[PDB]
């Protein structure tokens, strides 16, 4: 019946995806062999003796992260050509993603997507994970969205792309790679949800007091987010939230779909032994700007729409008491043309804790995704440090000499500048 396809492009997509599927295997009960020692259907398929193979593709142009998944623990869970690999890295280049390497890997990629989608009707949509700063995550990530719109037209396409920081970016040509990825995903992505790495680093340092975690500990917290989004698709609950009203409740205009997220409680075992976990305070934590997920301050941003996804033993009574408290609260301000501002979804399944991880066993949680005007500033800082480096032709010879012509930078520049004008106009 119901099924959702997860696409992970780039090695950022790979590392977010392996931790995303190890939680799903521990959420439904899938051993690293793909056996169940019935909500698997919405994320895991079937093939006889419990073999619940996954419904996800793993794109990367270089093999150095994909084939070590094949060598690692999760060999026989994943179907071997669901892990799709090239030979050479795109190496932080939009042109290397599109016109030289990606044209040879996208034919086998859509071949695998077509076989993995036509197995059963009931496809809610595609969950995209990529890195906009990278070469294959942005270049090849673009060309997959081009070929998905031409055939799979009316299907939903969620997005979770790792935007770079104002400070921690670990590259220099991500000003080029990111704003060429915007010219992709304003008109191809249905719902874009924003991510940022230091906005997960500062949550790990403050909310759990973990002074030295790594990339993989970021990937558990985001895996809990995606599992909470598909909580109602798989498990039962009081208010069902499937994918079709992530867009019709949060996207008021077709060019306005860039949006923010937050997760709560992010509390270790040594802090859960003193703090009581009430529904009122977990959503109060989800409204704090310091608890935000993509480093976008919402005091100068103005909440057009919001979604709350309660997961656990949440009674609907104090759902409505807590959400009435934030309307009374003045510092979280909403829009005059959207007086109501909230879609609530309750699921009875408690969050699943991973042993050996960072989180504890909590009985209730919130996954909040909010479309706000504050996304204007994450692109305005993109304005300032793009024009500061584009003005003197730096790092341009790599792009122009490799297939793509000069002038596509200027129209993608006018594209995100038009996005700036749209967010300023709607925010009056």
């Amino acid at each position: 019946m119901r099924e959702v396809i997860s696409i992970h492009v780039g090695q950022a997509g790979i590392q977010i995806g392996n931790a995303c599927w190890e939680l799903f295997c521990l959420e439904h009960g899938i051993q690293p062999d793909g056996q169940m020692p019935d909500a698997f259907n919405t994320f895991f398929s079937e093939t006889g003796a419990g073999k619940h193979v996954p419904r996800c593709v793993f794109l990367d142009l270089e093999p150095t992260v994909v084939d070590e998944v094949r060598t690692g623990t999760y060999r026989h869970l994943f179907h071997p050509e669901q892990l799709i690999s090239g030979k050479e890295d795109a190496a932080n280049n939009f042109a290397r993603g599109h016109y030289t390497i990606g044209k040879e890997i996208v034919d086998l990629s859509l071949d695998r997507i077509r076989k993995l989608a036509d197995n059963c009707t009931g496809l809610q949509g595609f969950l995209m994970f990529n890195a906009v700063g990278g070469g294959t995550g942005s270049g090849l990530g673009c060309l997959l969205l081009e070929r998905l719109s031409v055939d799979y037209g009316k299907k939903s396409k969620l997005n979770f792309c790792s935007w770079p920081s104002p400070q921690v970016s670990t590259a220099v040509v991500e000003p080029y790679n990111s704003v060429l990825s915007t010219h992709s995903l304003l008109e191809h992505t249905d719902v874009a949800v924003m991510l940022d790495n230091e906005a997960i680093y500062d949550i790990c340092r403050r909310n759990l007091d973990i002074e030295r975690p790594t990339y993989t500990n970021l990937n558990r917290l985001i895996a809990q987010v995606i599992s909470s989004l598909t909580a109602s698709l798989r498990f039962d609950g009081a208010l069902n939230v499937d994918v079709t009203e992530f867009q019709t409740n949060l996207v008021p205009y077709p060019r306005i779909h860039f949006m923010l997220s937050s997760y709560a409680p992010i509390i270790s075992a040594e802090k859960a032994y003193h703090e009581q976990l009430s529904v009122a305070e977990i959503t109060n934590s989800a409204f704090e700007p310091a608890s935000m997920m993509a480093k976008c301050d919402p005091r100068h941003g103005k909440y057009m729409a919001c979604c709350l996804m309660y997961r656990g033993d949440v009674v609907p009574k104090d759902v409505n008491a807590a959400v009435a408290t934030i309307k009374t609260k003045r510092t979280i301000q909403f829009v005059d043309w959207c007086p109501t501002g909230f879609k609530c979804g309750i699921n009875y399944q408690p969050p699943t804790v991973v042993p050996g991880g960072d989180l504890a066993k909590v009985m209730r949680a919130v996954c909040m995704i909010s479309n706000s005007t504050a996304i204007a500033e994450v692109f305005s800082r993109m304005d300032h440090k793009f024009d500061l480096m584009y003005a003197k032709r730096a790092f341009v010879h790599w792009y122009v000499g490799e297939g793509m012509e000069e002038g596509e930078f200027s129209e993608a520049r006018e594209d995100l500048a038009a996005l700036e004008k749209d967010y300023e106009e709607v925010g009056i």
């Binding site: 019935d38 909500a39 259907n41 498990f235 039962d236 009875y348 399944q349």
Partner: protein, 37 residues
Amino acid sequence: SPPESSLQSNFVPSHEEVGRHKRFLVNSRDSLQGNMI
């Protein structure tokens, strides 16, 4: 062996099909007119 008949002489199917469920977690509720515990 060919596949067997799945209809009796009463002209009705022979084997059920388990419906696609949603992992039912129950909710304990009862109120009004005594309204329990």
